[PDB]
Structures are given as structure tokens and as C-alpha cells.
Design a protein around this ligand. Structure first.
Ligand SMILES: CCCCC/C=C\C\C=C/C=C/C=C/[C@@H](SC[C@H](NC(=O)CC[C@H](N)C(=O)O)C(=O)NCC(=O)O)[C@@H](O)CCCC(=O)O
Ligand SMILES: [Zn+2]
Ligand SMILES: [Zn+2]
Ligand SMILES: [Zn+2]
Lengths: 214, 215
């Protein structure tokens, strides 16, 4: 088929920086390539078609061009809302084919997370399982380490992490870490703590609670 | 003018036929344009499935040509995809699109497992989720299958500060996620907060009040 090779797979750049995304076609496609932008919670949006025709409403900082079988999307003057995954699509032939995509992150100043902790609910404690949740708010960069401690003992294999997509306004992330314990194990121990390390923290931040305290 | 909306079963058994439908509004599918089906896999890759033109002529991706049909109902302004002999590899978000406008998509999972609606547990605000006049609270949405759930707060009246995290597949084979919101700490004794969880595949709707720690 006509194969589109998209590079790079991911990018990180500052507000006002310029980025270039490239798609190379395995054979001639004339100028029949479009560029697409996928933002979180939003329908996929076309930015450009015919290699260099901007759709109405799309800011002029988005620029499509071509040289032979090499196609480029150049985004100048990057803004926080430009966080997205970008795809090329060729329509010179059947089947239509997509590039592999480019994930674009917007850089910002290092921001340390604020950390909150949530004990299991009384409702859940009626079941056999207790979930403990540690929440990390509004941080950058995305890399963060959460260590769970139960009565000072380091936990492993019983927690899962989830991270939000980058915020379109302040370019921060938020993270949830969920510790899953059997109710039998939960009611045996007293001190439950999440220890958070991050680039913006000079020392670890620990948030803790004592089980059953009223 | 064109608006597009996908519909279809969220869960299909292997070897059966997956059917999805696009309802088009504000423009006749007989007037012009290609009317396309596209899918996005869990790995995030996009694939063009096929099209039907205003004329009724169809084009199918050769990788799918033996198990695909695209048809239309011009009296309903709808067009549909049928994909037969499905496997778990057909699990994807299915989108319809004309050349410019895409629908938001419909999620289809291929599995032999039956559907399960979530349990919803409060993440209560307390001293340990409050700092400088801002408090965090939420809901834990646990043990559902398949994707997706939608989570609102206060029936859609609360949107500011809401973070609904991506679902994670638990070791049980069931999905789980949390939805949290940051609110003024001054509001906790006064303003009611309820998370509204909708799981369309199991026709499960749950409202859960999230009240401050009473201890
Ligand atoms: C190729 C479709 C794949 C599915 C979507 C995925 C990615 C989108 C990326 C690129 C799209 C490029 C579209 C180019 C239009 S050119 C722009 C296009 N115009 C037409 O399709 C022409 C229709 C008109 N009635 C005419 O024939 O003059 C259009 O978008 N019109 C309405 C509007 O502006 O809203 C034509 O040159 C090719 C259309 C081929 C097709 O529809 O199969
Ligand atoms: Zn233990
Ligand atoms: Zn202990
Ligand atoms: Zn937030």
C-alpha cells in the first residue's frame, strides 16, 4: 500500500518554540495529504488538506508544506492548547493511510505536586477489598514517583498509576495512585502513607493517615 | 453544517458481526462527499476502514475486504459498517467522517465476557485533602467491563477543576478509574457534590454523594 512514515513519535517544546513533524510517503502522492489533530475529549480535527491549505479557523502558526514525497507540519509560536497527537493522512490512493502519529507535549516551568490522600470509604469496606488513593495535583514534568508504605513497610505489586493528559491552560499533569489491599490486610495495619518524589521536590513529601481514627 | 454521530453495541462476541451506524445531520449523504469509517486501536494507531460516496459506490481497505460491508439508508440519512468474523483485535474506537468533520466515535470491545456495571465509592474530602482554601474530593469507579464510562459532577453543573483519569485494567480483567475535583474548602459544609457515573454497555447509571469525613 502507500505507506506514510511519520517522525518523530513524540516531541516536547516550550511555549513560543517551533516544531516540525515530517511524513514521508513510500511513493508519489502528489499533494494529496492532510494533517489531523487529536486533543483529549475532542473529536479529531482536520488542520490542513492538499498539503498546504489551512482550514478556516485554524491559527496561522500551523503550516503545511511539501518537497517531493516529504511532507512537513510546522507549528510555530507554540501555545499550551497545542498539546495533542498529530497525524498525517494520504488520500492519493486507496486505501487511505495514516502516519503513526506524533505526541506533542508543551514545556513549562518545573512545578512540584501538591499531594492529597483518601482512605477507603465505609461502603467499600463492606466488600473484601480496600482501596487507598493518593492524588498528585498540578505538576510538571510528567515523571513522578509514588511509594506506598504500610506500617513503614514498602509496598510493591499492589498499586496502579493513572496520569491525566496535559492541561490545555497551565500545561500541568495530575496523577492518581491506587493501592489495592484485601480488607483482612487493611484492618491488620495502622499507618498508611504515600511518599512522593518529583524533580520539583527537594525532599520526599509524605501524606499519611491512621486507620479507623475518629 | 454537517454533524456526525456514531452508534453501536459496545460489546460483541468473537466470530460474530460488529455493526456500527453513523447518523448524519445538516446535510444529505446523497449530495456530495465520501462518507468514511475509521478506527483507532488501544495502541493509538489509526486505520481507514472504507467509504461510501454520495453515489452509493463503496471502497474497502484491502486488509479487511473479505469481511466488510458499508451500506446506507438514504431515508434515514445514515450509513453503516458491518465487520464479520471479529476477534479481540477488532477492539477499537469507531469513527465516521466526511472529508473534514469526524464524529466523536463509539467504543466497541470484542470479548466472550459478559458486561459488568461499576461500583462507585466516595473519595471524601478531609483535612488530608485540603490546602490553602482548596479541597479535593472524588469518586472511585471500580470493576466495570467493557469501556467506557462517562463521569459527570452534579449532573453536569460542575466542570471546573474536574479530572477524570484514564481507566486502568486491573489484574481481575475489570476496569477502574477515579474522578476527582478541586473545590473551595469553604463550600464543603454547604455545597452538595455528587458524581454521576454512566456505563452504557451494562445500562448502569449510578449517582454517588460525596460528603466530608464525619470523623
Ligand atoms: C479523504 C477523506 C478521508 C477521511 C477524513 C480523514 C482525513 C482528512 C484529511 C484530508 C482530507 C482531504 C480532502 C480533500 C478533498 S478537498 C476538500 C473537501 N472537498 C471535497 O471533497 C469536494 C466536494 C465538492 N462538492 C466538490 O466536489 O467540488 C472538503 O473537505 N469539503 C467540505 C469542507 O471543507 O467542509 C478532495 O480533494 C479529496 C476528497 C476525496 C474523498 O472524499 O474521498
Ligand atoms: Zn499486611
Ligand atoms: Zn502492621
Ligand atoms: Zn486541576
Amino acid at each position: 500500500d502507500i505507506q506514510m512514515t511519520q517522525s518523530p513519535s513524540s516531541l516536547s517544546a516550550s511555549v513560543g518554540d517551533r516544531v516540525t513533524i515530517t511524513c514521508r510517503a513510500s511513493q508519489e502522492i502528489s499533494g494529496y495529504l492532510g494533517w489531523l489533530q487529536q486533543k483529549p475529549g475532542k473529536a479529531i480535527k482536520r488542520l490542513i488538506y492538499a498539503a498546504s491549505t489551512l482550514d478556516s479557523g485554524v491559527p496561522s502558526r500551523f503550516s503545511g508544506s511539501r518537497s517531493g514525497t516529504d511532507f512537513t507540519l510546522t507549528i510555530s509560536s507554540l501555545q499550551p492548547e497545542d498539546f495533542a497527537t498529530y497525524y498525517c493522512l494520504q488520500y492519493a490512493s486507496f486505501p487511505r493511510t495514516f502516519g503513526q502519529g506524533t505526541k506533542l507535549e508543551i514545556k513549562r516551568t518545573v512545578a512540584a505536586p501538591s499531594v492529597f490522600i483518601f482512605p477507603p470509604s465505609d461502603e467499600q469496606l463492606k466488600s473484601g477489598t480496600a482501596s487507598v488513593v493518593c492524588l498528585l495535583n498540578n505538576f510538571y514534568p510528567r515523571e513522578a514517583k509514588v511509594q506506598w508504605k504500610v506500617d513503614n513497610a514498602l509496598q510493591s505489586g499492589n498499586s496502579q498509576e493513572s496520569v491525566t493528559e496535559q492541561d490545555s491552560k497551565d500545561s500541568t499533569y495530575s496523577l492518581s495512585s491506587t493501592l489495592t489491599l484485601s480488607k483482612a490486610d487493611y484492618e491488620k495495619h495502622k499507618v498508611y502513607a504515600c511518599e512522593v518524589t518529583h524533580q520539583g521536590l527537594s525532599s520526599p513529601v509524605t501524606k499519611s493517615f491512621n486507620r479507623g481514627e475518629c | 453544517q454537517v454533524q456526525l454521530q456514531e452508534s453501536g453495541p459496545g460489546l460483541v462476541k468473537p466470530s460474530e458481526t460488529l455493526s456500527v451506524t453513523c447518523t448524519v445531520s445538516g446535510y444529505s449523504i446523497t449530495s456530495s462527499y465520501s462518507w468514511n469509517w475509521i478506527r483507532q486501536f488501544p495502541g493509538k494507531g489509526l486505520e481507514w476502514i472504507g467509504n461510501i460516496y454520495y453515489s452509493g459506490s463503496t471502497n474497502y481497505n484491502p486488509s479487511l475486504k473479505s469481511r466488510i460491508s458499508i451500506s446506507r439508508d438514504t431515508s434515514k440519512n445514515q450509513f453503516s459498517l458491518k465487520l464479520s468474523s471479529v476477534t479481540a483485535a477488532d477492539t477499537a474506537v469507531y469513527y465516521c467522517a466526511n472529508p473534514r468533520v469526524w464524529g466523536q466515535g463509539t467504543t466497541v470491545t470484542v470479548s466472550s465476557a459478559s458486561t459488568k456495571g461499576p461500583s462507585v465509592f466516595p473519595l471524601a474530602p478531609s483535612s488530608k485533602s485540603t490546602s490553602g482554601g482548596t479541597a479535593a474530593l472524588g469518586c472511585l469507579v471500580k470493576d466495570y467491563f467493557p469501556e467506557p464510562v462517562t463521569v459527570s459532577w452534579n449532573s453536569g453543573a460542575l466542570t471546573s477543576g474536574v479530572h477524570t483519569f484514564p481507566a486502568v485494567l486491573q489484574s481481575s480483567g475489570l476496569y477502574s478509574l477515579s474522578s476527582v475535583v478541586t473545590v473551595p474548602s469553604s463550600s464543603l459544609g454547604t455545597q452538595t457534590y455528587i458524581c454521576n457515573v454512566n456505563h452504557k454497555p451494562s445500562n448502569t447509571k449510578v449517582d454517588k454523594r460525596v460528603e466530608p469525613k464525619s470523623c
